[PDB]
Amino acid sequence: AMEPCLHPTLVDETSLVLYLDLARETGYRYVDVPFHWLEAEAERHGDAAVEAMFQRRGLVLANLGLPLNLYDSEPVFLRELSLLPDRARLCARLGARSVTAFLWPSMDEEPVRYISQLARRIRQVAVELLPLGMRVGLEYVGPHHLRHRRYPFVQSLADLKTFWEAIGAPNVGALVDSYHWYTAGEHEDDLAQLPPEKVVYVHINDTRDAPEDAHDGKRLLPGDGRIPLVPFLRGLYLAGYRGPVAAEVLHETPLDGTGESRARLVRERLEKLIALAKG
Amino acid sequence: AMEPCLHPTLVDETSLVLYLDLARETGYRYVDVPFHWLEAEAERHGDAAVEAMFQRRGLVLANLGLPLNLYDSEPVFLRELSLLPDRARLCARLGARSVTAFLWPSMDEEPVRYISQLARRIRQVAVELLPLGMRVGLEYVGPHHLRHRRYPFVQSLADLKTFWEAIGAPNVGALVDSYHWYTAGEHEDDLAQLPPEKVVYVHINDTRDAPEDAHDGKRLLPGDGRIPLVPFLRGLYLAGYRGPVAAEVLHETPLDGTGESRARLVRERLEKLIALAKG
Amino acid sequence: AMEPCLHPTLVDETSLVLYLDLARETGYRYVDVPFHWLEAEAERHGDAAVEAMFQRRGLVLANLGLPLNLYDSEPVFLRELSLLPDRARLCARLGARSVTAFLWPSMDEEPVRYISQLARRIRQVAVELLPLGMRVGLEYVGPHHLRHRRYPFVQSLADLKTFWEAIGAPNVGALVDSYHWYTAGEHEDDLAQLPPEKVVYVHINDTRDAPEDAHDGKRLLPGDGRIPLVPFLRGLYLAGYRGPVAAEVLHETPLDGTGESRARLVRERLEKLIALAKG
Amino acid sequence: AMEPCLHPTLVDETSLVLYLDLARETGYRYVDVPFHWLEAEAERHGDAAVEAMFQRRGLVLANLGLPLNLYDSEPVFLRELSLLPDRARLCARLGARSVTAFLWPSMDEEPVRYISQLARRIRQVAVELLPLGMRVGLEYVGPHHLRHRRYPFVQSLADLKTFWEAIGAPNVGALVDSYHWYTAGEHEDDLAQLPPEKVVYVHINDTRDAPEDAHDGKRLLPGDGRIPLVPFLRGLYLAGYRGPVAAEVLHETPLDGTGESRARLVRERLEKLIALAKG
């Protein structure tokens, strides 16, 4: 089934132990946890202890945020790429099937250099992941205030699909965030026509701003705004997506309420959104 | 977690509806269902109805038995290969992450022909599956009575690992069956030293026959025989396998009891085996 | 080692037989011929005859100008791609080891859409040429007047090198033109430090214009201008390039003297420049 | 089109300079040279000098005998593999477009272990040669006395063709030997129906023995035996092969006449056979 997934931005919580406790307590099964959190624990207590935290609580790791920097110098990049398989296997064991990263909507660097190197490194990343049966989902970023550097890059799903050709790796798709689908002015049918395997991971959230205005860093809880979230989910559902939907609510200032009431409220809100979209 | 998975041979049951009912009723979540069963339903009632049968019962499809014949004529093979992606996507939606097939331990055909064509077609199969994040697990077959054709093929995990090189596809591993691990005279450490992603799917079962004697077609319920099943599981567990373990108990004659008592008894037996192996 | 190659730009001759007669009579071995003249003579006479023509005259085809349009619609590009292997085979028989294309130094199309699709299409051309032991030499274009479309593309070897990363094909190299090397303000060692198989084909020509002034369609014969041509061929030589070096002198207005004079004179100043290069 | 190539088996000459002098003096363009003689002369004199030697004499290296052992230990095979690209580059400069190896028609090693590893290793050799526009010509061996090891391997073109499927590399073809074509009881059209790029290199020789009798180390000069050689070259010709045709006459006992006589005589009977072939 499509299911609600807890995300760190929803709750005011930095302790790994307590974050996982909050997920269980508020009735989630899927948790999004950044890899540095898991790595900090693996180092202190070994990989098996980390798996025990998830399995003692009935939790499944939703995803692995790519743990390298696609813009490093070549020697650092290659080094971090060598380390990716073991980091990916640890996350597979905790339930993740996907590794994700976002793409900048604009940049100051010369296109042929920036785009070509980035195509090749993403390909290398995707290739290290083929033995593990994992896909790369690339988040296209839609808000307009990120477009004012010198040259355009990816600003939409249509853009992202042409960028797949540069990469040329069979296991590369999309992380689809409502915020970016909204800000890019896309339609339910843009998402419905994706092959299922190309919907790698999904974010949900909201805004009362018009597409041109909405700020990437100033988001609302799913359902406190104007984004058509039932058509968003429905489209993903008709695509054939059947996994976690995380409420990534990036914000600059304290969100309203407590970590706990927020977690429970959005779980409830998303189960209802998800059942309306199935319809 | 490693979990028990129901297999069709355990129960005396040919109706899809009732087989799925038996899985729920006997407390399983993972079910092994051959694809022809699911296809027969998809044809009568459309793909969505098939997904509804699993989701209404809390069930997850464990695996997809490769739905083509690796030994057909080229035009039929190519045709069935074209149809594999949509069949694989339907099974992904029901929860399967793996597509499997077994290899003959001996054959009458000339080696260079038989082995080369088979390497190339498995590669083609594995390649169609890279976009879906799915792995191919190849079952090595250990019993000795299948070795008396003209030429040897794969009879063990060590053999299978050399055959991976012929295939040259990054998402190809093993379906590990205790029956074949036993009959091939392998050790817990053979399985522990596998990379996790190479343990694609797992079968469990038993026998009172010595390795040289055991018949492929005349198996016993997990725990009614002499195969060291705790070291079998433990090895798979230390490899890093965290999925379904199916009791494939091929038999020529009625197994002892009812379908229901068998299903419940082996679930119980495997949860206990699995907890001893974790230890 | 390196040898002079007749380019059509040198001669008035627009008939294949007469062109080939002139190459013979002016001393050349290596002839560059536009592909259409060869498709055309293979239509009237047949494959056997075009081969007969060359060999009778001691002649070897230097190259094949990529006979398709890399910017066309997808269905038309695919058709021409499908035709490419037989055309490349006919050119292999005549001695062509290379297939070439130039890149636009600027474009109005959005960078992500343009760069990705063009990388993927060159990749497809390259894959089709792998069974034939043939390489793609991509021509980077340097002149400054060509750089005033909306977005920048390839303008230098350094740029071309990063573009090879997008393409991601083992058999893709450079067509190095003296006009472009000079107008890109490159150095002899930029050439020297290339692996020899990355130097696919070479053009040579001159200008009295500064690097920033020199015009694409208004070139001169080599040894009539300001470009250091001896360092040009010494960098190629030390890189390990060994085939034909063609005098591509594009011009809007007639080069004085006859075709027979320029042609014969070019061979001679080419041989001497190539001794000076070679120590 | 096709042209005669001096093979060492023809001449007493065991010194590279003297061998090359003889090819010149006996009329040849295409010379086959064992690689060690070239590694050896590139040690005393240097890369520049071995190139100088050839070009001064109007000579072109036909081929490179694969300078490694495909059956060695893994670490030793990998080292020699790593050395292969520079050795192949030095041979490219001398005009070699091909790299060749023969296959054993039988072996004692288990088929799965032997075939898989050897397919994967030839695949690795082929991948290293893709950036250089070079192909692998694999020599199938036909004589019947070679077929009495424990398991059968490649004995015919038909077999070799299926072996290419295991290897799965776009640049791998055949070394076609008249001795093997005859002793495999093949037909002219078996050759004709090959794509031209699959004909990598060609050996020619004779025997008075029947197909079933003829011995591998006991061959004759071409035009001294019972093999239809004109249909041999017409099938190659119509396949589209255009390079050197080498007289490999392995022998345990001296061929009568001098080296200078056999060498000169071979060129002549080769040219005439090649006219008869060509219609």
Side-chain angles (χ1 to χ4, degrees), chain A, chain B, chain C residues 1-43 45-279, chain D residues 1-43 45-279:
Chain A
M2 273 187 180
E3 278 192 76
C5 175
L6 189 71
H7 195 269
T9 62
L10 255 197
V11 306
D12 20 32
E13 201 34 275
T14 198
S15 171
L16 183 57
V17 167
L18 289 179
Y19 171 60
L20 299 172
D21 282 347
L22 205 160
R24 190 222 294 101
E25 177 60 49
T26 51
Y28 291 83
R29 165 188 155 189
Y30 276 114
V31 289
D32 191 320
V33 179
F35 178 72
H36 275 346
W37 295 40
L38 303 172
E39 194 174 58
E41 195 79 25
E43 288 178 32
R44 289 168 39 40
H45 302 127
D47 293 3
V50 174
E51 150 159 22
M53 303 182 99
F54 284 71
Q55 198 64 215
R56 281 186 54 71
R57 288 170 182 99
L59 302 167
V60 172
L61 178 71
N63 182 53
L64 168 56
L66 184 55
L68 60 70
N69 180 333
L70 284 163
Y71 318 93
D72 264 326
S73 67
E74 200 55 34
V76 175
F77 167 70
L78 291 171
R79 183 177 317 136
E80 297 299 314
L81 180 71
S82 274
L83 295 174
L84 164 63
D86 290 345
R87 299 175 179 156
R89 292 172 177 103
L90 167 60
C91 291
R93 271 168 58 179
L94 297 170
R97 290 300 100 90
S98 43
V99 176
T100 59
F102 74 89
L103 302 180
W104 290 97
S106 68
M107 76 285 186
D108 283 339
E109 295 107 306
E110 305 303 298
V112 58
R113 311 259 172 142
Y114 175 90
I115 299 182
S116 302
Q117 182 180 94
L118 182 70
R120 178 267 304 177
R121 287 182 171 191
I122 293 180
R123 176 193 311 148
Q124 287 178 313
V125 167
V127 168
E128 289 303 312
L129 294 167
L130 294 169
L132 314 178
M134 286 172 100
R135 290 160 297 144
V136 178
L138 293 181
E139 186 178 3
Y140 60 103
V141 168
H144 293 217
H145 66 92
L146 297 170
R147 308 184 186 181
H148 305 307
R149 295 188 191 215
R150 168 73 62 74
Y151 302 110
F153 193 40
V154 173
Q155 295 168 11
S156 73
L157 176 57
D159 290 357
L160 180 56
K161 282 173 153 169
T162 67
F163 184 52
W164 298 340
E165 298 179 33
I167 300 166
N171 59 327
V172 181
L175 193 178
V176 181
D177 186 315
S178 36
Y179 208 83
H180 296 326
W181 171 83
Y182 180 76
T183 50
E186 296 166 345
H187 194 274
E188 153 167 15
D189 298 344
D190 294 303
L191 305 179
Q193 278 149 10
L194 285 174
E197 68 269 10
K198 296 287 191 248
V199 190
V200 178
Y201 186 49
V202 174
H203 290 164
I204 201 160
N205 42 58
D206 226 328
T207 197
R208 293 190 181 187
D209 309 337
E212 317 86 73
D213 299 335
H215 197 288
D216 187 58
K218 310 183 203 163
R219 313 191 180 179
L220 289 191
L221 302 184
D224 293 333
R226 70 189 295 286
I227 303 180
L229 286 184
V230 180
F232 179 73
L233 296 170
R234 183 200 300 137
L236 288 168
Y237 192 82
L238 293 162
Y241 184 73
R242 300 293 183 268
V245 178
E248 186 178 66
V249 178
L250 302 182
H251 58 279
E252 294 189 357
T253 48
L255 289 163
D256 219 317
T258 80
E260 184 180 314
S261 69
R262 281 190 305 267
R264 192 178 322 277
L265 194 56
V266 174
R267 213 232 319 119
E268 278 161 27
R269 285 184 178 193
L270 292 192
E271 295 157 343
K272 293 190 186 106
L273 282 160
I274 287 160
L276 284 168
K278 285 196 63 212
Chain B
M2 273 187 180
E3 278 192 76
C5 175
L6 189 71
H7 195 269
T9 62
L10 255 197
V11 306
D12 20 32
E13 201 34 275
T14 198
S15 171
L16 183 57
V17 167
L18 289 179
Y19 171 60
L20 299 172
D21 282 347
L22 205 160
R24 190 222 294 101
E25 177 60 49
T26 51
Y28 291 83
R29 165 188 155 189
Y30 276 114
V31 289
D32 191 320
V33 179
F35 178 72
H36 275 346
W37 295 40
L38 303 172
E39 194 174 58
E41 195 79 25
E43 288 178 32
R44 289 168 39 40
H45 302 127
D47 293 3
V50 174
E51 150 159 22
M53 303 182 99
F54 284 71
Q55 198 64 215
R56 281 186 54 71
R57 288 170 182 99
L59 302 167
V60 172
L61 178 71
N63 182 53
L64 168 56
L66 184 55
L68 60 70
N69 180 333
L70 284 163
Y71 318 93
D72 264 326
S73 67
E74 200 55 34
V76 175
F77 167 70
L78 291 171
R79 183 177 317 136
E80 297 299 314
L81 180 71
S82 274
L83 295 174
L84 164 63
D86 290 345
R87 299 175 179 156
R89 292 172 177 103
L90 167 60
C91 291
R93 271 168 58 179
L94 297 170
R97 290 300 100 90
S98 43
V99 176
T100 59
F102 74 89
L103 302 180
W104 290 97
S106 68
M107 76 285 186
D108 283 339
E109 295 107 306
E110 305 303 298
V112 58
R113 311 259 172 142
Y114 175 90
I115 299 182
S116 302
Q117 182 180 94
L118 182 70
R120 178 267 304 177
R121 287 182 171 191
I122 293 180
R123 176 193 311 148
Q124 287 178 313
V125 167
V127 168
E128 289 303 312
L129 294 167
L130 294 169
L132 314 178
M134 286 172 100
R135 290 160 297 144
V136 178
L138 293 181
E139 186 178 3
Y140 60 103
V141 168
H144 293 217
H145 66 92
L146 297 170
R147 308 184 186 181
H148 305 307
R149 295 188 191 215
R150 168 73 62 74
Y151 302 110
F153 193 40
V154 173
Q155 295 168 11
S156 73
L157 176 57
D159 290 357
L160 180 56
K161 282 173 153 169
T162 67
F163 184 52
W164 298 340
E165 298 179 33
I167 300 166
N171 59 327
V172 181
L175 193 178
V176 181
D177 186 315
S178 36
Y179 208 83
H180 296 326
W181 171 83
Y182 180 76
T183 50
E186 296 166 345
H187 194 274
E188 153 167 15
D189 298 344
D190 294 303
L191 305 179
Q193 278 149 10
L194 285 174
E197 68 269 10
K198 296 287 191 248
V199 190
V200 178
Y201 186 49
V202 174
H203 290 164
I204 201 160
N205 42 58
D206 226 328
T207 197
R208 293 190 181 187
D209 309 337
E212 317 86 73
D213 299 335
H215 197 288
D216 187 58
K218 310 183 203 163
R219 313 191 180 179
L220 289 191
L221 302 184
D224 293 333
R226 70 189 295 286
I227 303 180
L229 286 184
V230 180
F232 179 73
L233 296 170
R234 183 200 300 137
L236 288 168
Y237 192 82
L238 293 162
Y241 184 73
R242 300 293 183 268
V245 178
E248 186 178 66
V249 178
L250 302 182
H251 58 279
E252 294 189 357
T253 48
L255 289 163
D256 219 317
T258 80
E260 184 180 314
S261 69
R262 281 190 305 267
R264 192 178 322 277
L265 194 56
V266 174
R267 213 232 319 119
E268 278 161 27
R269 285 184 178 193
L270 292 192
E271 295 157 343
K272 293 190 186 106
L273 282 160
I274 287 160
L276 284 168
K278 285 196 63 212
Chain C
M2 296 185 162
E3 272 174 310
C5 191
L6 195 79
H7 197 264
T9 56
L10 256 157
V11 297
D12 302 341
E13 309 295 325
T14 45
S15 166
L16 185 69
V17 62
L18 282 176
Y19 185 69
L20 296 168
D21 292 324
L22 193 265
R24 200 194 137 93
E25 297 156 295
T26 54
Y28 289 82
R29 187 157 90 210
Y30 274 111
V31 304
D32 198 30
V33 177
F35 179 60
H36 53 281
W37 306 7
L38 303 154
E39 175 158 79
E41 214 72 39
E43 262 284 302
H45 296 51
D47 276 335
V50 184
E51 295 163 29
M53 231 169 273
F54 278 68
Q55 295 280 12
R56 271 164 42 74
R57 281 160 252 242
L59 304 171
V60 167
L61 186 67
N63 184 63
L64 161 68
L66 178 57
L68 52 78
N69 171 6
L70 283 162
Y71 316 97
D72 219 327
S73 68
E74 195 65 24
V76 176
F77 163 77
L78 296 174
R79 169 55 64 81
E80 291 301 297
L81 186 57
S82 79
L83 293 173
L84 167 69
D86 285 322
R87 289 168 173 163
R89 289 171 174 107
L90 169 55
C91 298
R93 282 183 279 209
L94 307 167
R97 320 235 131 88
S98 43
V99 177
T100 51
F102 79 80
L103 307 167
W104 291 96
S106 46
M107 83 284 181
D108 303 325
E109 297 103 300
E110 293 295 296
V112 72
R113 326 295 281 239
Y114 183 91
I115 299 171
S116 302
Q117 175 181 106
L118 179 64
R120 180 273 301 182
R121 287 183 176 184
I122 298 173
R123 178 188 310 143
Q124 291 170 304
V125 167
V127 170
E128 286 306 317
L129 295 174
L130 304 169
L132 313 169
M134 287 175 100
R135 297 166 286 147
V136 187
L138 287 177
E139 176 163 19
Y140 65 87
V141 173
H144 290 228
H145 79 108
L146 290 166
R147 308 184 175 183
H148 307 308
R149 277 170 190 287
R150 202 230 221 293
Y151 306 104
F153 196 42
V154 172
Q155 288 166 26
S156 76
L157 182 52
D159 288 347
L160 172 57
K161 273 189 141 217
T162 74
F163 190 53
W164 295 332
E165 300 185 32
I167 294 158
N171 58 330
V172 177
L175 201 178
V176 180
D177 203 305
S178 61
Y179 217 80
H180 305 318
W181 170 82
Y182 171 62
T183 62
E186 282 158 0
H187 193 73
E188 169 194 342
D189 302 312
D190 296 315
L191 299 184
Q193 277 122 213
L194 293 167
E197 70 265 6
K198 283 337 180 226
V199 188
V200 172
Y201 193 43
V202 182
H203 286 158
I204 188 165
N205 41 53
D206 230 325
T207 192
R208 306 178 168 172
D209 295 320
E212 48 272 1
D213 281 22
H215 188 287
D216 192 62
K218 306 178 179 163
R219 321 184 183 176
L220 307 184
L221 302 173
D224 296 340
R226 145 187 296 166
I227 311 176
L229 292 173
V230 172
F232 180 66
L233 293 168
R234 188 169 52 179
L236 294 176
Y237 179 78
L238 291 178
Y241 185 80
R242 288 304 174 275
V245 166
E248 174 175 81
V249 193
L250 310 161
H251 56 289
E252 283 166 17
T253 54
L255 318 151
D256 73 322
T258 173
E260 210 188 9
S261 153
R262 300 184 295 277
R264 185 170 269 122
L265 176 64
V266 177
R267 189 187 28 69
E268 177 186 13
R269 212 177 288 155
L270 266 172
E271 293 163 354
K272 302 188 183 202
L273 291 165
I274 285 161
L276 281 116
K278 205 160 70 139
Chain D
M2 296 185 162
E3 272 174 310
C5 191
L6 195 79
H7 197 264
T9 56
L10 256 157
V11 297
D12 302 341
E13 309 295 325
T14 45
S15 166
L16 185 69
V17 62
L18 282 176
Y19 185 69
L20 296 168
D21 292 324
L22 193 265
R24 200 194 137 93
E25 297 156 295
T26 54
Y28 289 82
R29 187 157 90 210
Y30 274 111
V31 304
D32 198 30
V33 177
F35 179 60
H36 53 281
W37 306 7
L38 303 154
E39 175 158 79
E41 214 72 39
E43 262 284 302
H45 296 51
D47 276 335
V50 184
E51 295 163 29
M53 231 169 273
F54 278 68
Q55 295 280 12
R56 271 164 42 74
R57 281 160 252 242
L59 304 171
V60 167
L61 186 67
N63 184 63
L64 161 68
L66 178 57
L68 52 78
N69 171 6
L70 283 162
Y71 316 97
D72 219 327
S73 68
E74 195 65 24
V76 176
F77 163 77
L78 296 174
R79 169 55 64 81
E80 291 301 297
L81 186 57
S82 79
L83 293 173
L84 167 69
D86 285 322
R87 289 168 173 163
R89 289 171 174 107
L90 169 55
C91 298
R93 282 183 279 209
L94 307 167
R97 320 235 131 88
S98 43
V99 177
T100 51
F102 79 80
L103 307 167
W104 291 96
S106 46
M107 83 284 181
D108 303 325
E109 297 103 300
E110 293 295 296
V112 72
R113 326 295 281 239
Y114 183 91
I115 299 171
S116 302
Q117 175 181 106
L118 179 64
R120 180 273 301 182
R121 287 183 176 184
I122 298 173
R123 178 188 310 143
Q124 291 170 304
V125 167
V127 170
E128 286 306 317
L129 295 174
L130 304 169
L132 313 169
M134 287 175 100
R135 297 166 286 147
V136 187
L138 287 177
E139 176 163 19
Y140 65 87
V141 173
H144 290 228
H145 79 108
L146 290 166
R147 308 184 175 183
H148 307 308
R149 277 170 190 287
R150 202 230 221 293
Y151 306 104
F153 196 42
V154 172
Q155 288 166 26
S156 76
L157 182 52
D159 288 347
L160 172 57
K161 273 189 141 217
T162 74
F163 190 53
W164 295 332
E165 300 185 32
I167 294 158
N171 58 330
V172 177
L175 201 178
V176 180
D177 203 305
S178 61
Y179 217 80
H180 305 318
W181 170 82
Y182 171 62
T183 62
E186 282 158 0
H187 193 73
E188 169 194 342
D189 302 312
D190 296 315
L191 299 184
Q193 277 122 213
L194 293 167
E197 70 265 6
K198 283 337 180 226
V199 188
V200 172
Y201 193 43
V202 182
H203 286 158
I204 188 165
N205 41 53
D206 230 325
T207 192
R208 306 178 168 172
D209 295 320
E212 48 272 1
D213 281 22
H215 188 287
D216 192 62
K218 306 178 179 163
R219 321 184 183 176
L220 307 184
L221 302 173
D224 296 340
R226 145 187 296 166
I227 311 176
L229 292 173
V230 172
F232 180 66
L233 293 168
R234 188 169 52 179
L236 294 176
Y237 179 78
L238 291 178
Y241 185 80
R242 288 304 174 275
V245 166
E248 174 175 81
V249 193
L250 310 161
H251 56 289
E252 283 166 17
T253 54
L255 318 151
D256 73 322
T258 173
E260 210 188 9
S261 153
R262 300 184 295 277
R264 185 170 269 122
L265 176 64
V266 177
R267 189 187 28 69
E268 177 186 13
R269 212 177 288 155
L270 266 172
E271 293 163 354
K272 302 188 183 202
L273 291 165
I274 285 161
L276 281 116
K278 205 160 70 139

